[PDB]
Design a protein around this ligand. Structure first.
Ligand SMILES: NS(=O)(=O)c1ccc(SCCO)cc1
Ligand SMILES: [Zn+2]
Length: 256
């Protein structure tokens, strides 16, 4: 699987039939159709920068992984009664500034999107156990809007020169990714899925209503990552967002 014409989102269902399921992500959030819910608590994140571990070029994207052997870095509140442990963050982007986010809001596409993913350590004892469970994963999504350079992205962008090609990895330490979140954590939430294979319907989504910025030159750094292995002809990572998926009667809740 990939994002190209032959192996890309419109084709995933052949190998992963869940692609046509009832809880697929991402979605267009129609704000006239959201339900304000007063039982939602505020989102609380508390991440220890000592859990930052490694950055990895995975061919279609890059990931920053965290140690997840204990509850040093956690998400709580919102819709959740369980504590969720941070395991990774990453970004999705498009070929031009005009699209690239996964979630859209009233049809509006943003240039990129940040995902901060966690797993339910109250109920399960590893990512691998949690990942396919309906209550197993919690992902914060932040829409990234093209504009002024975002200096909080610095350490991440400066790391990419060490992982230019597929499979490269390097230590990435002492970093707290709550520094990337917008100053307001007002959110929407809905039950959904991983946005790429294996597409498990295991994710409770927390989508920030406030965007964070990114510059056109910062987006170019993502797009200049290479999907080929060292020594091969360069194939830039132009894009890696999945199209929005039908709600199938799900309700998006608003914390605000
Ligand atoms: N874009 S996403 O849905 O937040 C995501 C997070 C983590 C993973 S790894 C799960 C493999 O079991 C895949 C997708
Ligand atoms: Zn993602």
């Amino acid at each position: 699987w990939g994002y190209d014409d032959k192996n890309g989102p419109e084709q995933w269902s052949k190998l992963y039939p869940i692609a046509n399921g009832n809880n697929q992500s991402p979605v267009d959030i129609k704000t006239s159709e959201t339900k304000h819910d007063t039982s939602l608590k505020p989102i609380s994140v508390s991440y220890n920068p000592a859990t930052a571990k490694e950055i990895i070029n995975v061919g279609h994207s890059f990931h920053v992984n965290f140690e997840d052997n204990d509850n040093r870095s956690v998400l709580k509140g919102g819709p959740f009664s369980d504590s969720y442990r941070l395991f990774q963050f990453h970004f999705h982007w498009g070929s031009t500034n005009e699209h690239g986010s996964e979630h859209t809001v009233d049809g509006v596409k943003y240039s990129a999107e940040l995902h901060v993913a966690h797993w339910n350590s109250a109920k399960y004892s590893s990512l691998a156990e949690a990942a396919s469970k309906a209550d197993g994963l919690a992902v914060i999504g932040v829409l990234m809007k093209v504009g002024e350079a975002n200096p909080k992205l610095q350490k991440v962008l400066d790391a990419l020169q060490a992982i230019k090609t597929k499979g490269k990895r390097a230590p990435f330490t002492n970093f707290d990714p709550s520094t990337l979140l917008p100053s307001s954590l007002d959110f929407w939430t809905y039950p959904g899925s991983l946005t790429h294979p294996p597409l498990y319907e295991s994710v409770t989504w927390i989508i920030c209503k406030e965007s964070i910025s990114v510059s056109s030159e910062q987006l170019a750094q993502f797009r200049s990552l290479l999907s080929n292995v060292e020594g091969d002809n360069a194939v830039p990572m132009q894009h890696n967002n999945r199209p929005t998926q039908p709600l199938k009667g799900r309700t998006v809740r608003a914390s605000f």
